[PDB]
């Protein structure tokens, strides 16, 4: 911890989060697929998508958990996976001053049980995931676009959606209204290749195929 430029390591929190991680995996073996703690001390529970409601309810209501606040609910798109979407719940326990992360997965055509029954914060977070990633949440009080324009087609945060989209808007005097046209750019967005051909992080080197 005396190297001026290097973030010090908190071994005590790593041990506690590791123990609580085994604890959650022992109580809910039916849904928990993986548990891990990072080197900067963040615990992750990876679960089967069926266990969203049981896992989130236990964490909110168990007395040695008490994760009463849903800090965030978001989605990550990984096209290389068959289940391309990674649903992430970030929860805060004010009782124990801890955060935990619960992650699950889905694809384009599979619903994920709406978690509004556990946290009422999730209502808008799920509308956002539906709108930007096209993940359907079953049994939502009202699922509809929240961020995109009315009638907007597509889910912009999918990695295969183009940055500038497919349609642009202008005001057309002939029809006296704002019209939608196919997108053209006077200057195309310039794609830069930045990745260095030399490995940077040996500790993360993947095994050869």
């Amino acid at each position: 911890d005396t190297r001026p430029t290097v973030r010090p390591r908190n071994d005590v929190a790593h041990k506690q989060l590791s123990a609580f991680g085994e604890y959650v995996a022992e109580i809910l073996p039916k849904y928990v697929q993986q548990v891990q703690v990072s080197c900067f001390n963040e615990l992750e529970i990876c679960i089967h998508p069926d266990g969203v409601i049981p896992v989130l309810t236990f964490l909110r209501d168990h007395s040695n958990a008490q994760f009463k606040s849903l800090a965030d609910l978001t989605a990550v798109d990984i096209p290389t996976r068959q289940n391309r979407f990674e649903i992430v719940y970030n929860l805060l326990s004010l009782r124990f001053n801890s955060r935990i992360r619960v992650k699950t997965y889905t694809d384009e055509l599979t619903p994920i049980e709406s978690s509004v029954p556990v946290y009422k914060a999730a209502n808008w977070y799920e509308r956002e995931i539906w709108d930007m990633f096209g993940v359907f949440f079953a049994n939502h009080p009202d699922l509809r676009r929240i961020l995109t324009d009315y009638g907007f087609e597509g889910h912009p945060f999918r990695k295969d959606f183009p940055l500038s989209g497919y349609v642009e808007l202008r005001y057309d005097d002939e029809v006296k209204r704002v019209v939608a046209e196919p997108v053209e750019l006077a200057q195309e967005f310039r794609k830069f290749d930045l990745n260095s051909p030399w490995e940077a992080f040996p500790a993360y080197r993947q095994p050869p195929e």
Partner: protein, 342 residues
């Protein structure tokens, strides 16, 4: 073709169409639709204007950056005309008033100016010239407006023999002064019609169709050297036309016959106006003038444009002349006008 005027893109706002057009009289009813269509596909538009710049602002959003250019010009100044055409490949003339002013009369705007534009356009090596005349232009018409159209049409055809001349009927659209003219007669109670409008047949044409025909006339090699007649699909009696307007606007229609000599005197009275006359003696003649049938001339279908029925676009123009009670009435509510079978 120079390497700069070769078409590129997909015909959108940022594309290059290859057209470089000088549009005279672009600040009026027909000019805004023309400039809108040229700017949609990516043309370079030179807009010479006589008016205040504030009156050209509706044209600014019509083209991508740099594409709409504005110049000041004076209809009696040939050097101002030359500065505005020397770089263009097509010159479109839409200059005209429906009335006379102290400074510019029908001879000046329909003969002197179009021929000065035609003379300079040829000396400057402009490839295509497009002139807008009138369907009913005639040397023996009792409308000084139409007699000037006839004289200018011949001067244009002699000064620029390859000029494409387009003769439209009376054009309707949101700023037309045609169906808006009739709908504003309600302000005077009844509708004075000569012979009750039973002796006059009109064939109005939709503005967008006139604009589409003009745009094709530029891009079509065959249109060069020809005269076109742009007319609507149907012919109506003036009485049936004006009755249809009042039905679309849901206004009370009380037509009464007024002798020609009297309704002339009404025109003379409104001409005293120092601004824009509500009506003039000439406007009386033109409205009560049977729109000619010119079968020898080609029409819109030749240029590739399908004429739009008056019954599909009248509500668009006339919904603002309704009252709150009738604003929401729909396009199917009113009876279609009776069409003369031709």
């Amino acid at each position: 073709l120079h390497h700069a005027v070769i078409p590129h893109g997909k015909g959108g706002r940022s594309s290059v169409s290859g057209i470089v057009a000088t549009v005279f009289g672009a600040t009026g009813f027909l000019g805004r639709y023309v400039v809108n269509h040229l700017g949609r596909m990516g043309s370079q538009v030179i807009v010479p204007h006589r008016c205040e710049p504030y009156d050209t602002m509706h044209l600014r959003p019509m083209g991508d950056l740099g594409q709409i250019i504005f110049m000041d010009w004076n209809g009696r100044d040939k050097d101002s005309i030359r500065r505005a055409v020397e770089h263009s490949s097509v010159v479109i003339n839409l200059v005209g008033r429906e009335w006379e002013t102290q400074n510019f009369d029908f001879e000046d705007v329909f003969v002197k100016i179009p021929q000065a534009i035609a003379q300079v356009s040829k000396e400057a090596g402009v490839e295509k010239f497009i002139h807008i005349s009138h369907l009913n232009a005639d040397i023996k018409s009792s409308s000084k407006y139409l007699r000037s159209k006839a004289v200018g049409e011949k001067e244009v055809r002699e000064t620029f023999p390859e000029a494409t001349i387009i003769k439209p009927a009376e054009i309707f659209g949101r700023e037309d002064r045609f169906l808006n003219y009739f709908a504003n007669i309600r302000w005077f109670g009844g509708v004075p019609l000569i012979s009750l409008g039973k002796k006059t047949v009109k064939q109005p044409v939709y503005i967008v169709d006139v604009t589409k025909g003009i745009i094709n006339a530029i891009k079509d090699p065959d249109a060069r050297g020809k005269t076109f007649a742009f007319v609507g699909p149907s012919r109506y009696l003036l009485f049936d036309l004006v009755q249809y307007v009042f039905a679309v606007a849901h206004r009370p229609f009380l037509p009464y016959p007024l002798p020609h000599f009297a309704y002339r005197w009404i025109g003379r009275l409104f001409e005293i106006s120092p601004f824009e006359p509500w009506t003039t003696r000439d406007k009386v003649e033109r409205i009560h003038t049977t729109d000619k049938i010119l079968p020898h001339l080609p029409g819109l279908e030749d240029l590739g444009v399908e004429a739009t029925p008056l019954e599909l676009k009248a509500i668009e123009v006339l919904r603002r002349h309704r009252t709150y009670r009738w604003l929401s009435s729909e396009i199917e509510d009113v009876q279609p006008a009776k069409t003369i079978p031709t």
